[PDB]
Amino acid sequence: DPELAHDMVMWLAAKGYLPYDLERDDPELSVNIKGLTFHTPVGLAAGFDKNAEAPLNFCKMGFGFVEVGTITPKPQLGNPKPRIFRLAKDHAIINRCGFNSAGLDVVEPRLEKVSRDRWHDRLERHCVLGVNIGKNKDTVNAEDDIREGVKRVGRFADYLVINLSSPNTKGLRTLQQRDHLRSIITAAQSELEKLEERSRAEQFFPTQTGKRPLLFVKIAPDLTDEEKRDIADVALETGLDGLIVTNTTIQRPESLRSESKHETGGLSGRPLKAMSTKCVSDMYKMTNGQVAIIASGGIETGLDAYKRIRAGASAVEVYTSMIYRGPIVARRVKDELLNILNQAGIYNVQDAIGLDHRP
Ligand SMILES: Cc1cc2nc3c(=O)[nH]c(=O)nc-3n(C[C@H](O)[C@H](O)[C@H](O)COP(=O)(O)O)c2cc1C
Ligand SMILES: O=C(O)c1cc(=O)[nH]c(=O)[nH]1
């Protein structure tokens, strides 16, 4: 069952008993991305550590970054169980958590905690922190709820991710329209424009940098081409930092086996690879690679990753892999990714970005 596989791995992570990394990762993997130094391009995807529980553990376990939940502002319970199925036969997961956070009241000090204690012991080669934020199912003006995730938990972020594509929350995937998208992105970056004083990183608004998280938008793979062109023609113009370029898909492709394949939810995993990998490409090269890209959806192998890294992502989030291959999907993908850099010719990762569109 994925539900408690997700939860015991999170528990074993929370007290930290899971196996750690060691070899200190070769610098070929170093990826600078609009001023954020990521050690590893592999990270954890925006659904595993929901309520900011144990980011730094999974981090020390070989992910160069994690991305905390989606944090709504008021606590939610989401949808009744059973809400998330394995589709074993084609390495896939339908899910329908319909958001289910503890809230910005609860996670604010959980980051305050992680923000202070991340600098101290082990003298870290800082593993990067992404904060993912969203709306209470039935919120009136969604422009009002994104505004709180910034005001609250956004100063703790190495990168804030406005979630606008969970197929399971009440008309949330419909916010990605030129007029709505632009409003939410502006309103968010109006809030990051709350820069304030001190004595007038450990102390201060602390993020492997002065502050002001590199902002991000999460979009569904189920976009039109009509509208990917809008979304893009917005992003450059809004000066959006980057796009996390794959939530789950609502789609249910033919050639799918495990009998649960008909279930209402967000399909993740293998059949989100081709889906997702093409929808990186159309955003890197519909934005001159100017708008940074972190991609997820079916990334389970260095070859999967490099394949997609080339395509235009400077980083790679994992979850459905992480349930099948285990927690060592981080180090196993790192290793395969590295070998594919030597064999190919251009070592490193930064070099390989945009290589499908390189002039
Ligand atoms: C059980 C589950 C919960 C998820 N929760 C979230 C979430 O809260 N916020 C979010 O932005 N994405 C969420 N996602 C989407 C994943 O973060 C990821 O983008 C998607 O699964 C595709 O990646 P993968 O197929 O490589 O795991 C979730 C996915 C799954 C399977
Ligand atoms: O609410 C959910 O269940 C959900 C959110 C999300 O962002 N992605 C997903 O697959 N499910």
Residue numbers in the entry: 18 to 217, 244 to 402
Q: What's the publication's text?
A:
DHODH catalyzes the oxidation of dihydroorotate and the reduction of an acceptor in the fourth and rate-limiting step of de novo biosynthesis of pyrimidines, molecules that serve as building blocks for DNA and RNA and are indispensable metabolites in all living organisms. Based on localization and electron acceptor, DHODHs are classified into two families: Family 1 members are soluble proteins localized to the cytosol, while family 2 members are membrane proteins localized to the inner mitochondrial membrane. Family 2 DHODH enzymes use respiratory quinones as electron acceptors. Amongst the 6 enzymes of the de novo pathway, DHODH is the rate-limiting step and the key enzyme connecting pyrimidine biosynthesis to ETC at the level of ubiquinone.
The crystal structures of inhibitor-free EtDHODH and EtDHODH-ferulenol complex were determined at resolutions of 3.5 Å and 3.65 Å, respectively. Both crystal forms contain four EtDHODH chains per asymmetric unit. The fact that; (i) there are no significant intermolecular interactions in either crystal structure, (ii) EtDHODH migrates at similar sizes with PfDHODH and HsDHODH, i.e., around 45 kDa, in high-resolution clear native electrophoresis using dodeylmaltoside buffer (micelle size of 72 kDa) and visualized by CBB and DHODH activity staining collectively suggest that EtDHODH is functionally monomeric, consistent with other family 2 DHODHs such as those from human and P. falciparum. EtDHODH contains two domains connected by an extended loop and corresponding to a small N-terminal domain (N-terminus to Ala31) and a large C-terminal domain (Asp43 to the C-terminus). The large domain has an α/β-barrel fold with a central barrel of eight parallel β strands (β1–β8) surrounded by eight α helices (α1–α8). The large domain of EtDHODH contains additional antiparallel β strands (βC, βD, and βE) at the top of the barrel. In the ligand-free EtDHODH crystal structure, the electron density map of the N-terminal helix region (αA) was disordered, indicating the high flexibility of this region. The N-terminal extension found in DHODHs from other apicomplexan parasites, such as P. falciparum, T. gondii, and Neospora caninum, is not conserved in EtDHODH.
